[PDB]
Design a protein around this ligand. Structure first.
Ligand SMILES: Nc1ncnc2c1ncn2[C@@H]1O[C@H](COP(=O)(O)OP(=O)(O)OP(=O)(O)O)[C@@H](O)[C@H]1O
Ligand SMILES: Nc1ncnc2c1ncn2[C@@H]1O[C@H](COP(=O)(O)OP(=O)(O)OP(=O)(O)O)[C@@H](O)[C@H]1O
Ligand SMILES: Nc1ncnc2c1ncn2[C@@H]1O[C@H](COP(=O)(O)OP(=O)(O)OP(=O)(O)O)[C@@H](O)[C@H]1O
Lengths: 226, 334, 588
DNA sequence: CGTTTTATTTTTTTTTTTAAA
């Protein structure tokens, strides 16, 4: 989606990796593959084929996706310099950044009474100055591995979470969870949550109590581990 | 079932500490308004029916349901999660995440020839189990008004163009009701607060309050206790003995071969005190009782008789109602 | 042959049915005598017979049923030939009964060939769709006569040869016309309501039946089926049966006396004490809901709803009708649904069901788009199963703005056509209805019009002729009758009011009144003009929308109350009491 | 030692969803 010219629409290919290399990538990993282009002798009917149809496909080798540091980590012993080299693009307003870098930090959790405790920090933000919330959002979403982004109306309540679909040509439909569903071990960053919708606060509020996305929609009380 | 350990079965019934002792067990770490663990008193030594073997009429089921009202992020999920993490019939729910009509088994497209079947409903598979519901004044009018009957009727008339019947299912209910507002607005008796009338807001026996003590006093306690739940690195086996399983079996015996009756003793109280129950009805912006909660009282009668050893009715039990009720029912000052 | 065991069970079969069976005489020849018209072939025999004389050799019979049933069908024919002027044209139909024995859960592979008894409901059904089951043909060559059994699902037109070695794929087309074939139907049926489990649903199962059993089934009944489970030679499962056991001969409070028919209402001798002594009405106010208390007007009024209406002898230009539109409201926590639920026990087609759930397609069927059977079967439904019945419903409140499309039809049109991708016909509403709305905060605050106290749709309150509300008050001595009645509500000894009129004698006497058809040249019937006039003197004050659609009530309520006397020839007094509570209807 | 193989499209009713002064 960074190459596709002004007058173009992205398209997909198929991946068939067999044998050992299975289970070697998740959805939405930006990955680079070295393999072969190979056509596909789709034999069967003698008139729907028989064109020399050649519906090609790909063969696999690898899924590369664009302590070792310990001696150099010995070279440096400092706490504050992260703010000094994280997001240089604005001078000052360190306090917001250090507040973020805490969420980058983590490390608070316990399972007493059998029950868990939310060990994730969730900041709220009001303001319209020129802040470049868009700046820090892009910065974090790039450096924070396993990142996400949504906007003020791009994802209604079903999209950011799981949802449902309709088609009388492929079978039944599933949940196909959204960015908020997918962003575990990380952050999904909404921009202008104030302006999305009032009832939209509901399902997100459900995930306030973490890892609980209840759905009595596909005949379940499913969880999804938000 | 085990005949071996009969000793302690009788031992725990005749011990008046039932009020709190097992209730003290349930929240393992939390005192969180432990008049709510006495509200957990409501709940187990299992729940007898006045089924109607004599006349056969009317199907008077002894159902139980209460809610845990909101306006503060209190443990109105955590208990419900403690339960669902313990009871197998385990589900968690809330408004705006799912449909009101999840009793459907949808035929979006099927592996059939459009022999449209609605195989099994979801929210009703809790056969005497529980579905936890949260954030209750969240949904539209159709949602949460549609259920105005199943609560004490357990029927679901499937009167659609498809296949038809009158089915059965009955279970337990609890949620985290919320008014239109975050905080209960002061100066203002409770019937004004939730947007339900003095028939539907004043419906149950009691739908129980959850406030903050307006001072630091209560605040630091469970902090001081359970700040160090990370840092305690141990658990104290006190005289409130953490019953590993010695609790979990007696309740299973609690329903088997003695059978609570109701004779002539413990019923004249609110036979007579229905005077006191209803004559507070002369008033608007105040509230009295209505004649489904007296049913909830005769249902309250069932539990305490066998345990404490008179399966015929004793009279004190109704006090538990007043111990419960007027805690927010004669709190009707104006 | 092994199955000669069952042929000897078939010897056994003959041995008692031709011999002395019961009553000093035959049981199974009047069937035989009757079958001769089309060669009807349908005959019922008791299964207790295989206990009376076979001496519990049912287990020599009851296993090999589809195995040896054919042979039992052979026995039927061998019976008939022994005395009837006969040629072997006689076919098969055997429809066993008398099996003290009664389910879906008690089913396996293992259950083939038995005669268990099961009951279900009527839904989701299919029509006559015959089968030219037998027939003749041969191979390419010559042998053109085959009276064989081509009926097993593995049947095929081309055969190999008869006299000489012929082809093996060739076929003739042959005598499908001077021969004997069958006819049958097919449905879906769901688990009974006498049996009802937790969790599970009355799942659906599917079955066929014979000519004399065919099209003799109606809405929700309790019959005794036959347990001949059979395979699909696709597999998947099916089942089959051959015997059913779903008011000239009298109802309860009798023994045989004479009437217009055999014992249709014969027991006047005992009815009539409870027919005329007009305080019997108080039994019908008191001895019918002794476990219940409310207003005493409903408990003196519903009965004529249950009982037939007008059914007069007049025009073709327009219909006249008997029953009435009806309602009941109040607010809950007043015991306003006990009664409806009880009717399902009290009265026939007292289909207590919710209205909250139903669709506008609740009533008829909606669609089919594949060859289910014929690609257009949209004549299934929910209402017209009222076989001389009523459909009272709960939760008429949040209901949609389409149901009225049927209720508009209620007391004038009563006809049933659909604007779908199928066809249009019509049907006869046999039915009245009940109303089940409710108010917002309940109390119908007496400062605004009762129409406006709910303010629902336009014509609804034109058609519904009586509403009969019970509204709440706070005078607790009212309330202290109740619990002091429920003093005997659990205390199991005579825990209600002493009765004076059993349910079954009530239910029987309902009929005696419905075959009298009064005749009204009543001069007081001519002075209804004065009744209605002084009524409208009361209507003049308190100034609802009133007309002759309410006069219809003025007519029917009193005339059908003269029916309720089990009487022709209307009596004026019925009008005045009818006047009385109805003089409340404007003041209501 | 010879003589033959193989395709379907639009509308319903439910449960989803979505619109204007
Ligand atoms: N002190 C600063 N440091 C870095 N960038 C700045 C600074 N001041 C202004 N800018 C630039 O000005 C631009 C302001 O537009 P910007 O993207 O900030 O909108 P925004 O402030 O995010 O809008 P809103 O806050 O209403 O969502 C930013 O992209 C940012 O790069
Ligand atoms: N005395 C107490 N002991 C233990 N936990 C408490 C106490 N008081 C409050 N809490 C905590 O407060 C939290 C309240 O939020 P929870 O997620 O249940 O909110 P909620 O009940 O859904 O809120 P609302 O009903 O207002 O939407 C609980 O997780 C609980 O751990
Ligand atoms: N006159 C009476 N006779 C018998 N029972 C009464 C009478 N008055 C009050 N009651 C009792 O009061 C209770 C009222 O609550 P109830 O279960 O009737 O709600 P409901 O009327 O079914 O609500 P809805 O009709 O809206 O569904 C009844 O169970 C009933 O037994």
């Amino acid at each position: 989606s960074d190459q596709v010219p002004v007058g173009h629409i992205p398209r997909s290919m198929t991946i068939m990796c067999r044998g050992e290399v299975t289970r070697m990538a998740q959805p939405g990993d930006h990955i680079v593959v070295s393999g072969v282009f190979l056509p596909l002798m789709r034999t069967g009917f003698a008139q729907m084929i028989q064109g020399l149809l050649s519906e090609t496909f790909l063969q696999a080798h690898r899924i590369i996706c664009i302590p070792e540091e310990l001696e150099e980590l010995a070279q440096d012993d400092f706490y504050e310099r992260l703010a000094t080299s994280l997001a240089p693009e604005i001078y000052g307003h360190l306090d917001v950044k250090k507040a973020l870098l805490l969420l980058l930090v983590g490390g608070v959790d316990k399972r007493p009474d059998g029950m868990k405790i939310r060990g994730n920090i969730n900041i709220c933000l009001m303001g319209d100055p020129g802040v470049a919330k868009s700046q820090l959002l892009g910065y974090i979403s790039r450096l924070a591995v396993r990142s996400q982004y949504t906007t003020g109306r791009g994802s209604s309540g079903v999209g950011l979470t799981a949802a449902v679909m309709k088609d009388p040509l492929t079978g039944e439909m599933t949940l196909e969870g959204g960015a908020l569903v997918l962003a575990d071990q990380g952050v999904c960053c909404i921009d202008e949550f104030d302006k999305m919708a009032d009832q939209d606060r509901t399902a997100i509020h459900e995930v306030m109590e973490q890892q609980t996305i209840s759905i009595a929609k596909a005949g379940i009380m499913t969880t999804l581990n938000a | 079932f085990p005949p071996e350990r009969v000793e302690l079965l009788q031992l725990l019934a005749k011990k008046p500490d039932i009020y709190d002792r097992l209730a003290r067990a349930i929240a393992p770490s939390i005192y969180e308004n432990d008049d709510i663990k006495k509200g957990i008193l409501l709940q187990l030594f299992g729940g007898t029916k006045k089924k109607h073997a004599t006349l056969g009429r009317q199907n008077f089921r002894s159902e139980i349901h209460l809610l845990l009202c909101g306006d503060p992020g209190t443990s109105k999920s955590q208990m419900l999660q403690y339960v669902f993490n313990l009871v197998p019939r385990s589900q968690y729910t809330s408004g705006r995440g799912s449909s009101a009509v999840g009793l459907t088994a949808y035929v979006t497209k099927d592996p059939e020839t459009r022999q449209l079947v609605l195989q099994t409903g979801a929210l009703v598979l809790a056969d005497n189990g529980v579905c936890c519901i949260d954030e209750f004044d969240k949904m539209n009018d159709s949602t949460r008004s549609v259920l105005h009957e199943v609560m004490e009727q357990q029927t679901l008339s499937i009167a659609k163009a498809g296949i038809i019947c009158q089915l059965n299912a009955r279970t337990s209910i609890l949620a985290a009701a919320n008014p239109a507002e975050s905080q209960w607005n002061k100066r203002k008796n409770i019937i004004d607060n939730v947007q339900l009338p003095h028939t539907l807001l004043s419906r149950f026996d009691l739908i129980f309050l959850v406030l903050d003590p307006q001072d630091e006093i209560f605040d630091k306690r469970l902090a001081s206790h359970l700040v160090s739940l990370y840092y305690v690195t141990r658990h104290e086996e006190e005289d409130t003995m953490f019953d590993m399983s010695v609790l979990r079996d007696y309740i299973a015996y609690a329903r088997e071969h003695l059978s609570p009756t109701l004779s002539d003793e413990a019923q004249q109280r609110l036979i007579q005190a229905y005077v006191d129950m209803r004559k507070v009805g002369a008033g608007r912006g105040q509230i009295s009782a209505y004649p489904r909660q007296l049913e909830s009282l005769i249902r309250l009668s069932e539990a305490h008789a066998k345990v404490r050893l008179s399966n015929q009715v004793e009279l004190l039990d109704v006090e538990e109602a007043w111990r419960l009720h007027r805690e927010a029912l004669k709190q009707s000052a104006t | 042959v092994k199955d000669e065991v069952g042929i000897r069970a078939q010897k056994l079969f003959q041995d008692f049915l031709e011999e002395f069976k019961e009553d000093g005489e035959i049981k199974y020849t009047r069937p035989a005598a009757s079958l001769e018209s089309p060669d009807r072939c349908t005959l019922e025999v008791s299964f207790e017979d295989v206990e009376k004389y076979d001496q519990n050799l049912a287990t020599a019979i009851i296993e090999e049923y589809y195995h040896i049933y054919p042979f039992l069908c052979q026995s039927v024919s061998n019976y008939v030939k022994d005395r009837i002027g006969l040629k072997t044209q006689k076919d098969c139909y055997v429809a066993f009964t008398e099996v003290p024995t009664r389910k879906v859960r008690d089913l396996t592979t293992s259950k083939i060939g038995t005669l268990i008894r099961i009951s279900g409901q009527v839904v989701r059904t299919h029509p006559v769709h015959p089968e030219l089951v037998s027939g003749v043909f041969m191979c390419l060559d010559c042998q053109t006569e085959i009276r064989n059994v081509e009926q097993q699902f593995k049947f095929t037109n081309p055969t190999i040869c008869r006299n000489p070695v012929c082809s093996n794929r060739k076929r003739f087309m042959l005598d499908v016309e001077k021969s004997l074939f069958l006819d049958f139907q097919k449905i879906r049926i769901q688990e009974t309501q006498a049996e009802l489990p937790r969790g599970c649903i009355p799942r659906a199962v599917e079955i066929i039946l014979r000519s004399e059993l065919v099209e003799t089934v109606q809405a929700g009944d309790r019959y005794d089926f036959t347990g001949t489970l059979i395979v699909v030679p696709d597999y998947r499962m099916a089942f089959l049966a051959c015997s059913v056991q779903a008011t000239d001969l009298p109802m309860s409070e009798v023994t045989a006396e004479d009437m217009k028919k055999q014992m249709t209402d014969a027991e006047w001798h005992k009815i009539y004490e409870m027919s005329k002594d007009r305080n019997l009405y108080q039994n019908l106010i008191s001895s019918l809901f002794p476990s219940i208390y409310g207003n005493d007007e409903v408990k003196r009024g519903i009965l004529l709803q249950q009982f037939g209406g007008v059914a007069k002898t007049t025009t073709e230009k327009t219909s006249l009708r008997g029953d009435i539109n009806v309602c009941i409201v109040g607010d809950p926590s007043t015991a306003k649904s006990q009664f409806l639920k009880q009717v399902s026990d009290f009265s026939p087609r007292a289909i207590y069901t919710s209205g909250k759930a139903s669709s506008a397609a609740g009533l008829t069927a909606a669609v089919v788009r594949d060859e289910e059977s014929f690609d257009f079967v949209i004549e299934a439904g929910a209402l017209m199963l009222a076989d001389n019945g009523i459909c009272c419903i709960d939760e008429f409140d949040k209901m949609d703005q389409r149901d009225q499309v049927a209720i508009h039809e209620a007391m004038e049109q009563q006809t049933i056509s659909i604007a779908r991708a199928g066809v249009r016909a019509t049907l006869n509403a046999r039915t009245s209805i009940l109303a089940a709305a409710n108010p917002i905060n309940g109390r119908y605050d007496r400062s605004k019009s009762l129409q406006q106290n709910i303010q629902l749709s336009a014509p609804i309150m034109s058609r519904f002729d009586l509403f009969f509300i019970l509204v709440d008050e706070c005078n607790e001595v009212v309330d202290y009758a109740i619990a002091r009645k429920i003093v005997d509500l659990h205390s199991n000894i005579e825990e209600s009011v002493e009765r004076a009129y059993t349910r079954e004698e009530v239910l029987r006497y309902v009929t005696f009144a419905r075959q009298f058809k009064p005749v009204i040249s009543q001069e007081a019937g001519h002075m209804l003009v004065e009744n209605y006039g002084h009524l409208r003197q009361r209507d003049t004050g308190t100034s609802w929308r009133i007309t002759v659609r309410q006069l219809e009530s003025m007519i029917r309520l009193s005339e059908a109350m003269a029916k309720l006397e089990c009487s022709n020839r209307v009596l004026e007094r019925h009008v005045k009491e009818a006047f009385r509570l109805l003089n409340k209807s404007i003041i209501r």
